[PDB]
């Protein structure tokens, strides 16, 4: 089968065949996406040339997310623009 397996938060190198997941090759159409906190773990799993660094959110996105974690009573005293308050 053509499988897409999303390994989540790997923390040590582990053999994919031992658990049962076949390592995809260029001759096969399967893709295996894995996430980890460590560059070393990503390199050890033969992912060295398809590595993505998860960048942190920007200022605008940060502010938009921060508002969503406030009650309407408090959001009313922070959201308004035009007038400037401390």
């Amino acid at each position: 089968k053509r499988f897409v397996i999303l390994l989540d938060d790997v923390r040590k190198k582990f053999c994919l065949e031992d658990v049962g997941i076949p390592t995809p090759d260029i001759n096969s159409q399967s893709k295996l996406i894995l996430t980890s906190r460590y560059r070393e773990v990503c390199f050890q799993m033969n992912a060295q040339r398809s590595l993505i660094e998860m960048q942190i959110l920007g200022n605008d996105a940060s502010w938009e997310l921060f508002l969503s974690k406030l009650s309407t009573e408090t959001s009313a005293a922070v959201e308004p623009l035009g007038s400037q308050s401390a």
């Binding site: 065949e17 076949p22 390592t23």
Partner: protein, 224 residues
Amino acid sequence: LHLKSNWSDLDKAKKLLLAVETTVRARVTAEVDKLNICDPQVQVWLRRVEELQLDAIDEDYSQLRKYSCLGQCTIHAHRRASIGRRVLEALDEANKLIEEGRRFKKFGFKPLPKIVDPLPQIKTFGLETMLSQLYDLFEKGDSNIIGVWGQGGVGKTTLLHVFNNDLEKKAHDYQVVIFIEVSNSEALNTVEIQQTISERLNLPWNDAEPIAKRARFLIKALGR
């Protein structure tokens, strides 16, 4: 007028046949997911159902219905015999297919284990010469036992994996190819090796069987 009643019965037969085909196809797909090949009888039944082509007779009946405005118009009454025969043939064929399909209980069978079982294919570098030497000893060798030795961590198990995966391409008279990892212990875990050999020989693995008796049985089995 039995033609209209028989065509309504044929429509009900198409609906029932579609339902039965859906059920049997679902079970066959379930069996295939377990790596079991579909039962040949079920395959024949599916082939017969796929070729029933009831839409052709349906479209012919639609074309006749285009001209079915007056019964006294005996100009088109000759086509009634053709419809009157094909409708009944389709109906009884569909009912036979229904009766055969509803009675099926086994939908797949475990295929015989392949000659060569695929093993992981790691990208090698400069293994061609070693593969050529190993193949030369494997083919022209007068001695049946071949030993490969090297420093720790130097291409050995990888060499075996590549050789095993390459045996698939070439033609050979070797019926069964078995890959056994005695590396798992220095105590010679015999049960694991016997399990691997039995699984690769399609033999029925037993738990309570004594080790020596299983060894003798496997010696007799591999000797053939």
